[PDB]
Design a protein around this ligand. Structure first.
Ligand SMILES: [Cu+2]
Ligand SMILES: [Cu+2]
Length: 128
């Protein structure tokens, strides 16, 4: 509440929300990601990744293609605004980023890059 948000990914490849609002009074924003499932990183990993809506597909494609040993992200990917590490059951990670990286009126998406086979894990992120 206010300048943070706690998000979960499960064994059903779902995030517990598909929408994040960042208040513009915030100097920083923090995402606390957790995994209440039972399965490990290699089979059911989740990360939290931020990019503009235009860049999401590119990030996911090159990320899925980068493999487990890179946490499913293209190394040196400038399109990534912020991200957590890849987590499995019972693990957690948090990322804090400067609200200055976002611009009001601009369209952003948060998403996971783990190749699950099910429908892409994503949601909207808005600066207001
Ligand atoms: Cu995921
Ligand atoms: Cu990175």
């Amino acid at each position: 509440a206010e300048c943070s948000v706690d998000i979960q990914g499960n064994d059903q490849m779902q995030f517990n929300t598909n929408a994040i609002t960042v208040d513009k009074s915030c100097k920083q924003f923090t995402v606390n990601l957790s995994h209440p499932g039972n399965l490990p990183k290699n089979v059911m990993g989740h990360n939290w990744v931020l990019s503009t809506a235009a860049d999401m597909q590119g990030v996911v494609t090159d990320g899925m293609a980068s493999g487990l040993d890179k946490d499913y992200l293209k190394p040196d990917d400038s399109r990534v605004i912020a991200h957590t590490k890849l987590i499995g059951s019972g693990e957690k990670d948090s990322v804090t980023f400067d609200v200055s990286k976002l611009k009001e009126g601009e369209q952003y998406m948060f998403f996971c890059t783990f190749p699950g086979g099910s429908a892409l894990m994503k949601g909207t992120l808005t600066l207001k």
